Amino acid sequence: SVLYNFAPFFAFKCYGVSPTKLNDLCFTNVYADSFVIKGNEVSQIAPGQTGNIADYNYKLPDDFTGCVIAWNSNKLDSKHSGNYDYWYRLFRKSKLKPFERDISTEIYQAGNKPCKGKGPNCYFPLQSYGFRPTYGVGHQPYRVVVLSFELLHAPATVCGPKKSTNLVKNKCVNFNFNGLTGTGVLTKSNKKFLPF
Amino acid sequence: STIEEQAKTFLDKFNHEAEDLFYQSSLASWNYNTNITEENVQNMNNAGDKWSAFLKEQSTLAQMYPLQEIQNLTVKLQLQALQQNGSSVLSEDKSKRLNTILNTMSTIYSTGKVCNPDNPQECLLLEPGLNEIMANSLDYNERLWAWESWRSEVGKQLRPLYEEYVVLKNEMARANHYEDYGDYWRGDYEVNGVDGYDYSRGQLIEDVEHTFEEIKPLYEHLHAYVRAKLMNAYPSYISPIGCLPAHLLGDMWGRFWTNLYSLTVPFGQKPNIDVTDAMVDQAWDAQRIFKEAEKFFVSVGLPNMTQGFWENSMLTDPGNVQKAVCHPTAWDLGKGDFRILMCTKVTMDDFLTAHHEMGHIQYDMAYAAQPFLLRNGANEGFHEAVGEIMSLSAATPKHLKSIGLLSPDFQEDNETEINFLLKQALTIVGTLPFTYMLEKWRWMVFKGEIPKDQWMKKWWEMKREIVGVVEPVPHDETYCDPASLFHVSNDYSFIRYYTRTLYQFQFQEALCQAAKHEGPLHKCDISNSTEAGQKLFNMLRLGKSEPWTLALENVVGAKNMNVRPLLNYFEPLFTWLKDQNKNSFVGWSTDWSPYAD
């Protein structure tokens, strides 16, 4: 609900789950990942879609997953000398099984050369996005939160908020106090339901 | 056994650690040009230098991959460059002497002052005064004193200086496998290995001599006109059958002939439509000129101007004492950063500029999706051309009409068409004959077809010949008449101006048919079409990825320049242009010399 408490969230594609009923139904549990990236790549992050972000830096599967949320963060994230803090892996070795992870700096190599490489290059996978405030709206920094729900063997505990209706008293009314159901007049009382 | 792939990576880095260096080197330059101070100069001295660093080294680590194995042309090209050591390979102590030369001459031409020929007081400086003196009065003398005030003077200073660079410049070339600097210079077009779309490095020369020997017929009648209309405002002087001498012609050296619409005016009783006034009547402000342009482009369905344009572009004079350089010029610091810097002064000579300098930004926004080392234009003159066609459809008696600006009360007639042409045909057909020579001469001199002790002769020889001009006074072998203008003394190839004048009409007549024309083509107006719209983008997109040869075919419809289309724009004129000569003479009597007399 307070999810609408974000700006025009540049995205919210709910591949997999009905975007609606979001609060209507519950699943075992839900993780929420997050990272900063340029806006010319906020699409790679999507079932099947390819490219660098999905290749050595964060590959989703195809499973519903749940949804995605993106917002431009320049305002505070960008700088004026180059926010040279956010990084990326230009090249790993192969790719990642949906939702893997690799952080080892591991200066890239391979090439059976004195410095196994691609012609005196011995490149290093980590490069610095380096944002600035005057850039386009395709090289400006966007923020993302990937919503991963799931329904294991046990229940949907996390689950969600349900509404009331206020008590009536002295009038046939069907009901659902806690989780017990039935139809009857809900008068006052005189019992001492022990504290539990 | 990856000989490539072991390099498709070398690029993958460059492509990232360059853009960042280039952004912070083009920025610097705006800041100066916009705000003129001192620290700003320095502030750019660093990054305006740094970039260099990156470059040189990457070239080192670029030949490390013998191009021979590369086969994906995309990479055979991104590499084609980088490697190019070009200079630097040249001798050291010698590379020094060269670095020197340039300066000397490139400087001389700058402050070069002309003291009075009758007083050490009237020392006119070119920018203001030397120029006026030329495109101003009519009286003889000062015109000669000025054609004398430079040649055997501000150029003699460099006469042997030109004879200098020709030595080392050709050395460097040799090394880099290029008979003459001209063979280096004649390369932007050399397209190798593409099956049918191939093009040589010499084929060009011939296509020129062809296209040109087709124009003579027109040009011939134009020197025919003036030659006589320059016998009216002038007394016993211009021999009625010889060559229009220098001084009395147009500008200084006389590249263009524009400064003349007066002396020659088909029917000097016509309106010469000028929407300047009306601009000052609707109260048209500056931010209008640009919003109009933007539209023209969006009408034909092309991207709107971004939000970084309307918020970062110096679109007026230099604010306060904010000394600014006032040169219309659209920038592209990369990263979506597109900007314009023109001091738009309310008028109809700036409303066309806008449409001319937004096309630069509209091309620069299509190729924006290509490797940094492939973002430019197929060949040298596809960049202007693709933004002049706009300053052609913009000032159409229709557009200005249909645009709620030009009094729709247009009493349009023949003696205005017949008249708007002698204007657009004194600065796009009188410049052609001159663009050749210069190039020829050097293209030769370089190759070594002339020995210094003769260089001079040719100039004048190929001046009464190809063009039709005689030396007001006889000139000495130690004068660099050729080398006495910016380009000549600032190493700039000058054929991007003969191939931009012939690709503009091949683009007009093509994106014209598409929008359903049918009448005088000077009357074309693509505004509001959409078929032509796509016509262009399908070329503006390929940036420099594919050969220029085929880039045309996408549009135009062939793959080699054509003088036919251009000879149609003024086709109207070539009628009244023979009926106006009628019995007068045509052709030049090479002999007659206003000095050899």
Structure, described:
This is part of a larger assembly, with chains A (196 residues) and B (597 residues). In chain A, strands 1, 2, 3 and 6 form a 4-stranded antiparallel beta sheet that branches. In chain A, strands 4-5 form a two-stranded antiparallel sheet. By secondary structure, chain A is mainly beta. Chain A has helices at 53-57, 74-77; strands at 31-32, 35-38, 66-72, 87-89, 126-128, 141-148, 173-174, 183-184. Chain A is elongated, with a radius of gyration of 25 Å. In chain A, 5% of the residues lie in helices and 16% in strands. Chain B has one domain (1-596). In chain B, strand 3 and strand 4 (338-340) form a beta hairpin. The longest helix of chain B is centred in the N-terminal third of the chain and has 25 residues, at 39-63. The chains are: A mainly beta (196), B mainly alpha (597). Chain A: Residues 1-161 form the BetaCoV S1-CTD domain.
* DSSP, total strands of chain A: 8
Strand order, main sheet of chain B: write it out.
Answer: 1-2
Range of strand content of chain A: 15-25%
Q: Any idea what the shape of chain B is?
A: globular
Q: What's the number of helices of chain B?
A: 26
| Main sheet overview of chain A | 4 strands, antiparallel
What radius of gyration of chain B results from the CA coordinates? 25 Å
Span from first to last CA of chain B?
A: 77 Å
Got a strand count of chain B?
4
Which percent bin holds the helix content of chain B?
40-55%
